[PDB]
Amino acid sequence: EHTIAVIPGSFDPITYGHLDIIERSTDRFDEIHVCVLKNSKKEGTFSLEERMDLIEQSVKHLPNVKVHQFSGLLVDYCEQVGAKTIIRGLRAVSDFEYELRLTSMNKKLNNEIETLYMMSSTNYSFISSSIVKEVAAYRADISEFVPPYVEKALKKKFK
Amino acid sequence: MEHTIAVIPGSFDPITYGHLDIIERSTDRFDEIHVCVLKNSKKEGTFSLEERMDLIEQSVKHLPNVKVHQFSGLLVDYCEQVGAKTIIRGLRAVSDFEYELRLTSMNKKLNNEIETLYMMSSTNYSFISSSIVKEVAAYRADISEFVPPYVEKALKKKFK
Amino acid sequence: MEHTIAVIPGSFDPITYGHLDIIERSTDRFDEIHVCVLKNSKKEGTFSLEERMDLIEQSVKHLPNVKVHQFSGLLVDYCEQVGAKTIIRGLRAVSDFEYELRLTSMNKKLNNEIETLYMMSSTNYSFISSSIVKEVAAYRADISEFVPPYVEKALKKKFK
Amino acid sequence: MEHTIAVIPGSFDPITYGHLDIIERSTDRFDEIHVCVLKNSKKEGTFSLEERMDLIEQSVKHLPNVKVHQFSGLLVDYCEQVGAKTIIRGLRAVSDFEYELRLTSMNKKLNNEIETLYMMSSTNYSFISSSIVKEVAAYRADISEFVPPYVEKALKKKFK
Amino acid sequence: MEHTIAVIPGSFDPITYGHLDIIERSTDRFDEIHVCVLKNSKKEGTFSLEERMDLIEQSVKHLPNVKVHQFSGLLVDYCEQVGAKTIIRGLRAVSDFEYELRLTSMNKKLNNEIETLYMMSSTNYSFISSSIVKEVAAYRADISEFVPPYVEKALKKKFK
Amino acid sequence: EHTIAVIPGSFDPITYGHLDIIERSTDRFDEIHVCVLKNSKKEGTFSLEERMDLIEQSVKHLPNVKVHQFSGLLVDYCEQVGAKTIIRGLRAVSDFEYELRLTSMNKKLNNEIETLYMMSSTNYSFISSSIVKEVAAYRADISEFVPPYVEKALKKKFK
Ligand SMILES: CCc1cc(-c2nc(O)c(C(N)=O)c(=O)[nH]2)nc([C@H]2CCCC[C@@H]2C(=O)NCc2ccc(Cl)c(Cl)c2)n1
Ligand SMILES: CCc1cc(-c2nc(O)c(C(N)=O)c(=O)[nH]2)nc([C@H]2CCCC[C@@H]2C(=O)NCc2ccc(Cl)c(Cl)c2)n1
Ligand SMILES: Nc1ncnc2c1ncn2[C@@H]1O[C@H](COP(=O)(O)OP(=O)(O)OP(O)(O)=S)[C@@H](O)[C@H]1O
Ligand SMILES: Nc1ncnc2c1ncn2[C@@H]1O[C@H](COP(=O)(O)OP(=O)(O)OP(O)(O)=S)[C@@H](O)[C@H]1O
Ligand SMILES: Nc1ncnc2c1ncn2[C@@H]1O[C@H](COP(=O)(O)OP(=O)(O)OP(O)(O)=S)[C@@H](O)[C@H]1O
Ligand SMILES: Nc1ncnc2c1ncn2[C@@H]1O[C@H](COP(=O)(O)OP(=O)(O)OP(O)(O)=S)[C@@H](O)[C@H]1O
Ligand SMILES: Nc1ncnc2c1ncn2[C@@H]1O[C@H](COP(=O)(O)OP(=O)(O)OP(O)(O)=S)[C@@H](O)[C@H]1O
Ligand SMILES: Nc1ncnc2c1ncn2[C@@H]1O[C@H](COP(=O)(O)OP(=O)(O)OP(O)(O)=S)[C@@H](O)[C@H]1O
- CATH number assigned to the domain comprising residue F107: 3.40.50.620
CA nearest neighbour of E8 among E109, E97, E78, E98: E78
A neighbour chains, 3+ CB pairs within 8 Å? B, C, D, F
Nearest CA to ligand 8 atom 17: F9
B69 in Cβ contact with B38 (< 8 Å): no
The question of whether D25 is a catalytic residue gets the answer no
Strands F4-9 and F31-37: parallel
Q: In chain B, what residues touch E18 (CB-CB under 8 Å)?
A: none
* Rg from Cα positions in chain D: 16
Domain extent at residue E26 = 1-160
Q: B94 touching E, CB under 8 A?
A: yes
Q: F93 touching C, CB under 8 A?
A: yes
* Distance separating alpha carbons of residues D28 and D19, to the nearest angstrom: 16
In angstroms, what is the span from residue F17 Cα to ligand 8's centroid?
7
CA nearest neighbour of D88 among D154, D13, D28, D157: D28
In angstroms, what is the span from residue A94 Cα to ligand 3's centroid?
12
Q: Which residue of F has its CA nearest to E73?
A: F138
State how many domains chain E has: 1
Which technique was the structure solved with, according to the deposited record? X-ray
Using the Cα atoms of residue B64, residue B66, residue B67 and residue B68 in order, give the sign of their dihedral: negative
Q: In chain F, what residues touch A3 (CB-CB under 8 Å)?
A: 28
- Please report the resolution in angstroms: 2.3
Q: Which of E123, E124, E145 to probe by mutation at the B interface, max B CB count within 10 Å?
A: E123
* Distance separating alpha carbons of residues C86 and C24, to the nearest angstrom: 16
Q: Which residues contact F62 (CB under 8 A, 6 or more apart)?
A: F22, F23, F26, F32
Q: Which residue of E has its CA nearest to B123?
A: E123
In angstroms, what is the span from residue F6 Cα to ligand 8's centroid?
14
Neighbours of A130 (CB within 10 A): 11
> ∠ at Cα D126 (A104, A122), nearest 5°?
65
* Distance separating alpha carbons of residues D147 and D128, to the nearest angstrom: 9
DSSP state of B122: P
* Distance separating alpha carbons of residues F75 and D136, to the nearest angstrom: 11
Q: Tell whether F43 is in a known binding site.
A: no
Strands F114-119 and F85-90: parallel
H or E element: which one contains F107? helix F93-109
The question of whether B43 is a catalytic residue gets the answer yes
Q: In chain C, what residues touch B126 (CB-CB under 8 Å)?
A: 105
Burial B9-46 (b: 16+ CB within 10 A, else e): bbbbbbbbbbbbbbbebbbebbebbbbbbbbeeeeebb
A77 in Cβ contact with A35 (< 8 Å): yes
F89 in Cβ contact with F119 (< 8 Å): yes
The question of whether E43 is a catalytic residue gets the answer yes
Q: Which residues contact A59 (CB under 8 A, 6 or more apart)?
A: A19, A22, A34, A65, A67
| Residues A127, A133, A135, A139, Cα dihedral to 10° | 140
* Rg from Cα positions in chain F: 15
Question: CB A114 to CB F118 under 8 A?
Answer: yes
The question of whether E69 is a catalytic residue gets the answer no
Q: Give how far Cα E112 sits from Cα of A7, B27, D16, E2, F128, Å.
A: 40, 56, 49, 19, 20
Tell me the HSE value of E123 on the side-chain side, using a 13 A CA sphere. Answer: 19
